[PDB]
Symmetry: C6
Subunit: 191 residues, 6 copies
């Protein structure tokens, strides 16, 4: 569905998968985030939104339109403490979706810290995060290009059930996770 993304980050309850939720209603341009989130995860949300605001042009998001919307990012399991930077790209994917009405591919999950430059930084506890995705029955799990080496210590079986896609840019995260090509118009050529 739109605005809904499955992230993998640390939670009081160990640190499994997250059901990040966002809503883009008519407002003044205010940003709200809830779900028993720690400071680090909160700042990851603020960064994620700047990454979207600073790419609104190629994302189709109109600046005027934006200043007329209130954004609320909620991470259900409201009583569950959650923290860390790992939901970075998921937060960014959820916002893009919300402001563009573009659905989030099903059975897709993602983990990784996002920078302002759009870079996807490696996270910790990939093992736990993949096992959580496994048990959740997820299909496609996007991970930071820099955690590739961590896969090695992950049970082949688990690895067998996951369609792991290492990324390094949020541009890739968006293309894989979203349905409608998030960036620019499609040009078709022929040899």
């Amino acid at each position: 569905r739109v605005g809904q993304v499955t992230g993998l980050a640390w939670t009081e309850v160990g640190g499994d998968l997250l059901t990040i939720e966002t809503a883009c209603v008519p407002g003044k341009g205010k940003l709200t985030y809830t779900g028993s989130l720690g400071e680090v995860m909160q700042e990851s949300i603020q960064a994620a939104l700047t990454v979207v605001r600073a790419r609104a042009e190629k994302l189709g998001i109109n600046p005027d339109f934006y200043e007329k919307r209130d954004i609320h990012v909620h991470v259900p399991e409201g009583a569950t403490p959650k923290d860390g930077p790992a939901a970075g790209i998921a937060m960014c994917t959820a916002l893009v979706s919300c402001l563009t009405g573009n659905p989030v591919r099903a059975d897709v999950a993602m983990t990784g810290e996002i920078t302002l430059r759009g870079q996807v930084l490696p996270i910790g506890g990939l093992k736990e995060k993949l096992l959580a995705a496994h048990r959740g029955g997820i299909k496609t799990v996007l991970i930071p290009f820099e955690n590739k080496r961590d896969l090695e210590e992950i049970p082949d079986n688990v690895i067998a059930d996951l369609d792991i896609h290492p990324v390094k840019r949020i541009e890739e995260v968006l293309t894989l996770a979203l349905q409608n090509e998030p960036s620019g118009m499609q040009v078709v050529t022929a040899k």
Copy 2:
């Protein structure tokens, strides 16, 4: 008369029981206020509840830009009782709808459950005492999270008999079921 009210079942420092969720929606400028010795999780569930309504304003027959000149005060009575949790979520959501549409809530219904921005109802803990409270309170029908159905076998024989429980999964049900004209 610009204020909805719905009986909810949520956690209180004096055992999670029966509460009257109140919501006023008066001439303002888009200000959200919430009182009632509310814990943080409960405070946040009030924010989730309001967003759900704002995302379906037109869908529910409410001015899509109603929030521009409308102030909203969410209070949960007996202001001295320390209370918390996401279980009053759907109740807060219903109250908001009632306040904004002028559509009255059935006084003989009670509800408990965590609400999601997508409108789904999540399961809650301490289901026994919640219903036990609705029973002691004299509630005819109670809405509960579909996921809490397995929770009903641990519910006392007389209360499950005394009460008309209706497991729900979404907020659409809750609203048609709880509103007097919906």
Copy 3:
């Protein structure tokens, strides 16, 4: 401006007689409250204003009074800590009075927790509260309908001197407390 009401609420030195003052001066819609007020008493002031807000028209008050009015609620004995919800109905009576010019009766005191729906809720320490009103020469006291059971424990002489009215809703409170129409 500056409407006054004798409320009976909890102060650091137990239940006591309080003089609630409310200033409603020309402004921008800011609510200020002072007098060493605890968090719960602060929330009852907020609940009390949201109640006249939601009922401004029926009270003959301009529906957009808050848009250009500033409210200062001050409870004298500035150093004395106070808290609790028992002053709610009196805050609502003070606000109503300030905004409509209708003066508050003398020899009248009230105690009761206010809800957004306008229902008056039972408070505690009624004995200590009524003794205070008695020692202060109060003629008429307003208590919540559900505090009638607590009357049995009050000395007969105190009961005999005081003209006690158990009220259910805020409308009764204003009718009995305001010396004019409302």
Copy 4:
């Protein structure tokens, strides 16, 4: 001394005299309070300001100053902690003088809690306050009418050179402290 008043209010190093300062410069209506002020003393300033606002009309003050002027209340001895409500009437006097250009009389000091209704309430530690007025070279001292009984246990010599005026209302204070016709 326009906007400068000598108030007798508690401080960490004792209940001596304080020189209240006020600046009401053109701005957008923001009120600043400084001088290591306690919460209670800070609220006494808000109380006093409201009093002036409610009577701006009768006090020859543009009852629209609230949004056109910036007010800064400072109490020198910057690092010295100060608190309590005993400086309330001095704050009000200080403010009125600032908004009207009406200077305050020399050799005058005042102590007393202020209410929004303009009533002057009794204060504590009178013995130390008046002692600080003596050494301060103060001629006239205004005190809460209800601190009159305190004058008894006060040394003859201290009283001796003091023109103590126990007042009941803020009007008495303005007329007694200000130089020009209030």
Copy 5:
């Protein structure tokens, strides 16, 4: 665009030579202050501005400048805790110098607490402040007039090398500290 004054005040390292900076670029009138400042020192900044604002035109400063200007006061060595009211006269001197373009002399250092009326109040730790100005090779030092006796405790070799000016009011410091006569 940026005023700079060498003041003397208390730092985590003790009374030291401080460079008080002040930017006054275009804005809407927001006051910002940084440099690990304690509350007392922050309040002295607020007091120092109000003084300039209150003497705007006399100081040759376009009144209503605070309507189109932003002010940021920063005291370098951002990691070093700093506090006290002793840099007040210097804060006022950096502002005046910032808003008028009148340069401040580098061979001048000052210490003193500033009141709204413009009086300079005595400060503490005169010894370590003056010992610091000497080490830093400062030739002229402004100290509060009430601090003169204190000089008798500081060693004569240090004081003999310093051209010290005790000051009672802010005009004096602006006259002695500002390169070009204001």
Copy 6:
């Protein structure tokens, strides 16, 4: 490449090679900074911003960008704590680059406290700072002029490797770090 500057500052773990990021998208003048930054570092960002504002026209920047843009300064490693004023010049640089579009040299690292006057103050832990730049792969490192003495206590192996540029003012920092000419 623009809005990204390599800096050397204190960090809990130890990797002093920080990558300061800045976004200056269209907004209404909102200042925000994240990355687990301590207070001194947050303030250093504040002084850096004011430095830019002061030299706006000189840098060819619109003198009213502060009200037409939203500034977000992030320092990747969201979880890693960072503090100190040593990233001040990196902040100013990243900031100037963002508002002008002028790319930043990827081979230049910098450390140093910045002041409003634009001067670069010495910093601490220079050995660890440079060692970080060494391994990290930086070829040019800008440092405070006054830190020149600290080099002698750092192995030749590392410094012989670096193109150390001691600086006194922000101008030389900008001309040296920005790709083009400020």
